[PDB]
């Protein structure tokens, strides 16, 4: 299986970033980890390079799995991140800004995000 590393990212304002894809789907930034680099150290590295965001990880949040339309198996494991700054629309990109719990809830492509997002929010200190 291939590890990946993301990151739920929010602001002082308690809102999250999100990307929007060539697709046009909204999801978190994500990427695969180098060797030898720690996961916690990849999603940082990943969301910079996602969205031009520096951000660093407050707290671990779980894995989810799947397989990817080529039918490798991936596992990525997300982290709860304190972000500033504006993001920046990245190549393929369509999209990319920061929501507020409520519009992210209503933007948000992949039911499994969902979850993530409120996870996120119950460990995302007030």
């Known amino acids: 299986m ?4 993301g990151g739920v990212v929010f602001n002082a304002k308690r809102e ?5 894809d060539r697709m046009g789907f909204w ?6 980890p180098e060797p030898g680099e ?8 990943e969301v ?7 951000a660093e990880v407050l707290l671990p949040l779980y894995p989810t799995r799947y397989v990817n339309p080529k039918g490798v198996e991936r596992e990525v494991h997300w982290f709860l991140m304190r972000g500033e700054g ?4 990245e190549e393929g ?7 507020s719990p409520e519009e992210a809830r209503a933007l948000l492509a992949f039911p499994e995000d969902l979850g993530l997002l409120e996870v996120a ?6």
Do not use: I, Q
């Open 16 to 20: 999250v970033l999100l990307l929007r």
């Open 86 to 89: 504006a993001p920046r629309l």
């Open 38 to 45: 720690s996961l916690e150290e990849a999603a940082v590295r």
């Open 121 to 126: 929010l119950e460990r995302l200190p007030l």
């Open 48 to 54: 910079w390079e996602e969205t031009g965001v520096r």
């Open 93 to 99: 990109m369509t999209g990319a800004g920061w929501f």
């Open 27 to 32: 999801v978190f930034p994500k990427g695969h």
């Open 2 to 5: 291939e590890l990946g590393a």
